[PDB]
Point group: D2
Chain length 122, copies 4
């Protein structure tokens, strides 16, 4: 599934995730968000299970983007946790957490949760 | 906060997170879980906001561990999203998502959510 | 939106949510899950914002089901948090948390997170 | 555990949750938040597993508050999912989701996640 994961993915928001999966579990790449306080591409890094089971289960993975690049600093970071499912309609199904830098008093309002689905077309 | 983040952290479960923060936002390191289907150390990678605001807000960050190393393969990955708060009781406050590889039919039961707090002592 | 919310909704799993919205914010009804350790109907109760803004924003709401009825006891409860959006393709968009009764030591593995979308057809 | 749950609970934010647990799984009561856009008391309703297992596992429960009362309308609702653990340091351990009414375009930024722990003292 190194082969399966590596490439360009798109989510339902129009965001673009470009990733290379390394042989021993690394994910590296760039993320471009169609939504929020984001412009251009941001570095991403993450991990995947390089030896998934072969019972039709997906391949567990995750990655993080900190929302800082040369154009913008959104004082926040998102992590996506999910799985890759291969085949003719290959998908990466995720849930994510977006934490923004807040005072310790405003900690309760720091973290958004949502869900993105990534496909190889759009 | 490169300085502040780099080092060894412990959570309320007894887990140990060793991390180096790089100058332009990288987090690399190892994670050893006191809980779950985990043995020894696992690679982690993530990102942090290398230029946080200076109003007392924390520093947004996240990282991922895929639960595969030479000893075990738990067909799963966790991502932690949170923030570093510095000072005499420095903390990394997080929420996490743990996704396990599942059939597409069992997707609804794939992802656990929780929260860990990391400190420099314990 | 009392009118809009009251009725029968279906999610992407084939589950059926029957609800009455009361004038001062109550939600009462029954839930029948197509997934998991569930049979027949279960009581639900919840709340909604009975005076939403009129800028095209949805109507905030939530409800809980404890997974006990005469046929089954799954020692667990789900809560759905989300919003009702009206019109020709009316939707209730939700995120949910499912907590299962666990020992205090297994607390970290107690809570699943996911997302359901409800429609008036299927 | 009807007995155990019924009463007044306090969380780490100073919020106060007053609840009655009914014999067949109902939770009714009032919630007063020390945090956020909240004043005075708000209705809550929820459910609990009225027949938990007796292996030391907690009692699964959840409830919802819509943030509207005579004083304020915050166009939002929170749901808490968690468990009651009895004994000399009785606790209700929760994760919560707070959804705010948003346009369908801003749906991705609608829902906060966090965690509250409730105790019988403070």
């Amino acid at each position: 599934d190194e082969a399966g994961i590596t490439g360009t993915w798109y989510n339902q928001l129009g965001s673009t995730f470009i990733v290379t999966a390394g042989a021993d579990g690394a994910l590296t790449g760039t993320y471009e968000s169609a939504a929020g306080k984001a412009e251009s591409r941001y570095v991403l890094t993450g991990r995947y299970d390089s030896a998934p089971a072969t019972d039709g289960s997906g391949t567990a993975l995750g990655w993080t983007v900190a929302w800082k690049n040369n154009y913008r600093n959104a004082h926040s970071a998102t992590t996506w946790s999910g799985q890759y499912v291969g085949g003719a309609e290959a998908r990466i199904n995720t849930q994510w957490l977006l934490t923004s830098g807040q005072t310790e008093a405003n900690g309760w309002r720091s973290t958004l949760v949502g869900h993105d689905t990534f496909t190889k077309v759009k």
